[PDB]
Structure 1
Amino acid sequence: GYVPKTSLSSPPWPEVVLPDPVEETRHHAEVVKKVNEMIVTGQYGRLFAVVHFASRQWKVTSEDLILIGNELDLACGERIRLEKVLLVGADNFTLLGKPLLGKDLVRVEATVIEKTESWPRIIMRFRKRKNFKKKRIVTTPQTVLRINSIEIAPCL
């Protein structure tokens, strides 16, 4: 089952040889340990998180504002722990869940600043030659969250 060197004997692509799983595992463990150490030391500087709120995914940091188009039914100034941090990253290392990270690992805090209505949004139907002409004005309710803090723990 041999073929001499031609354009279609071997693949166009290069052959990758993936490493031994035991060694690989060890390497992974080592990497994890390093990360843990870093976390312990406070060697990081500012984190970010891709959090899941209201079916949307948001890359978020301490001090930023996020506008969610609906009522949360919270008084303003109340503090919230956002679950579903499916990415948490920084300079020098990042952590992604499968898909969500655990609650022990990370937590994101958010203060509700304001609850509002959107500017009036105009719905309006029309059809040619057929006396069909509708017009509905709407104001979708909104909330403004200020993400205060991303705490990250040495659980790894």
Structure 2
Amino acid sequence: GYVPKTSLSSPPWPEVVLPDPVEETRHHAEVVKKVNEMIVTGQYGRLFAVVHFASRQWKVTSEDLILIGNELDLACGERIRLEKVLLVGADNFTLLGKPLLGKDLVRVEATVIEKTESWPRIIMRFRKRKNFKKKRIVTTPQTVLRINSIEIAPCL
């Protein structure tokens, strides 16, 4: 089944040889052990989590703010554990879940600061030659969360 080396003999992409799963699962065990040592001995600096709060993914560090487009029905000042964190990164490692991380691994806290309304937000409809002109003004409720801490735990 030999073909001599022409342009179209072989495919143009170079072949990759993926490593065998014995040495590769052993290698993964080495890496997870390293990173778990960095989480034990506290080598990391500040973290960022990607959190699936509400309907969307917020990339988040500690000490910041998120404006959410609905009333959460909590009192201002209440702390909240955001579940559904799906990426956690430090300077030298990340951890990403399939699709979410373990609750025993990462803990993201956030307080409610304020519960506002939005700025007034116009909804106008108009069709020409039809005398069709409606106007509405909508303000959605909003709450602001202050992410207090992303604490990480050695559970690998």
With normalisation by structure 1, the TM-score equals: 0.99
Q: Which residue of 2 aligns with 1:48?
A: 48
How many percent identity over aligned positions?
Answer: 100
How far, CA to CA, are the matches of 1:53 and 1:40 in structure 2? Answer: 27
Q: Which runs of 5+ in 1 are unaligned?
A: none
- How far did 1:54 drift? 1.3
Q: Which residue of 2 aligns with 1:38?
A: 38
How far, CA to CA, are the matches of 2:75 and 2:38 in structure 1? Answer: 38
What pairs with 1:3-152 in structure 2 (closer than 5 Å)? 3-152=3-152
- How far did 1:53 drift? 1.0
How far, CA to CA, are the matches of 1:139 and 1:98 in structure 2? Answer: 37
How far, CA to CA, are the matches of 1:129 and 1:90 in structure 2? Answer: 60
Aligned residues: 156
With normalisation by structure 2, the TM-score equals: 0.99
How far, CA to CA, are the matches of 2:38 and 2:90 in structure 1? Answer: 12
How far, CA to CA, are the matches of 1:43 and 1:118 in structure 2? Answer: 42
| Runs of 4+ more than 6 Å apart | none
How far, CA to CA, are the matches of 1:140 and 1:26 in structure 2? Answer: 53
| 1:54-103 deviation per Cα after TM superposition (whole angstroms, max 9, x unaligned) | 11101001001000000000001100000000001010000000000010
How far, CA to CA, are the matches of 2:90 and 2:134 in structure 1? Answer: 50
- How far did 1:123 drift? 0.1
The 3-state SS of whatever aligns with 2:45 is coil
- How far did 1:11 drift? 1.0
How far, CA to CA, are the matches of 2:82 and 2:29 in structure 1? Answer: 29
Q: How much is the aligned-residue C-alpha RMSD, in angstroms?
A: 0.4
- How far did 1:148 drift? 0.1
